[PDB]
Design a protein around this ligand. Structure first.
Ligand SMILES: Nc1nc2c(ncn2[C@@H]2O[C@H](COP(=O)(O)OP(=O)(O)NP(=O)(O)O)[C@@H](O)[C@H]2O)c(=O)[nH]1
Ligand SMILES: [Mg+2]
Length: 170
C-alpha cells in the first residue's frame, strides 16, 4: 500500500533488563551477549510494513541507570508510545517498571500507548515474576503486555508491531 507514517517510541526500564538488546533485535536482527550499558540514550530507526502502511519507528533507547532518571522526560516528551521493560528473573526490576508506568501516566502525553515487556523470558527456569500476575497488572493499567526474549527473538517483532497497530488512526 502507499501510505506512510512515523512515530516516536521510547524504551524505559531498570539498567540491564535488555532495552538495548530488544531494539537491536528489532532494528538489526542482532543480539549481543556483551552489550555495554547505555549512556543517556541511543537512537535507532526501523521501517516496517503494516497492512497498507509503511511505518517508520523513531526509537529512543534510554539509559536505565538511576543517574540518568532526570533526563527521561527529554526522551518521553513527545513520544506516541513507550515500552517499559523488566527482567522476568528480577522482581525488583518489575517494581521499577511499575514506577516508570506511573511516571508516564502522570507526565507523558495523555494519549501515549504503553507496552510492558517481561524480557529475558528464555530464562524462565529462574523466573521471579509470575506471567499471570504481570498480565493482570497490565490489564488493570491498560498496558500491552508480552514476555519477550531479545536473545531468541521471542515476541520481539510482535510487541513492536502490536504497538504500531494500536496507534490512533482516525
Ligand atoms: N538471556 C537473555 N539475556 C538478555 C536478554 N536481553 C538482554 N540480555 C542480556 O542482558 C544484558 C543487558 O542487556 P542490555 O540490552 O545492555 O540492557 P539495557 O536495559 O539496555 N541496560 P542499560 O539501561 O544500562 O543501557 C546483556 O548482557 C544482554 O546480552 C534476553 O532476552 N535474554
Ligand atoms: Mg542499554
Amino acid at each position: 500500500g502507499n501510505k506512510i507514517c512515523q512515530f516516536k517510541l521510547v524504551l524505559l526500564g531498570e539498567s540491564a533488563v535488555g532495552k538495548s538488546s530488544l531494539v537491536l533485535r528489532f532494528v538489526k536482527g542482532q543480539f549481543h551477549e556483551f552489550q555495554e550499558s547505555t549512556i543517556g540514550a541511543a537512537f535507532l530507526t526501523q521501517t516496517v510494513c503494516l497492512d497498507d502502511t509503511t511505518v517508520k519507528f523513531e526509537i529512543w533507547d534510554t539509559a536505565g541507570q538511576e543517574r540518568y532518571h532526570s533526563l527521561a522526560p527529554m526522551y518521553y516528551r513527545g513520544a506516541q508510545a513507550a515500552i517499559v521493560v523488566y527482567d522476568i528473573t528480577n522482581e525488583e526490576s518489575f517494581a521499577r517498571a511499575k514506577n516508570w508506568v506511573k511516571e508516564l501516566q502522570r507526565q507523558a502525553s495523555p494519549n501515549i500507548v504503553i507496552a510492558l515487556s517481561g524480557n529475558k523470558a528464555d530464562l524462565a527456569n529462574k523466573r521471579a515474576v509470575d506471567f499471570q500476575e504481570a498480565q493482570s497488572y497490565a490489564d488493570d493499567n491498560s498496558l500491552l503486555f508480552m514476555e519477550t526474549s531479545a536473545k531468541t527473538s521471542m515476541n520481539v517483532n510482535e510487541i513492536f508491531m502490536a504497538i504500531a497497530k494500536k496507534l490512533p488512526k482516525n
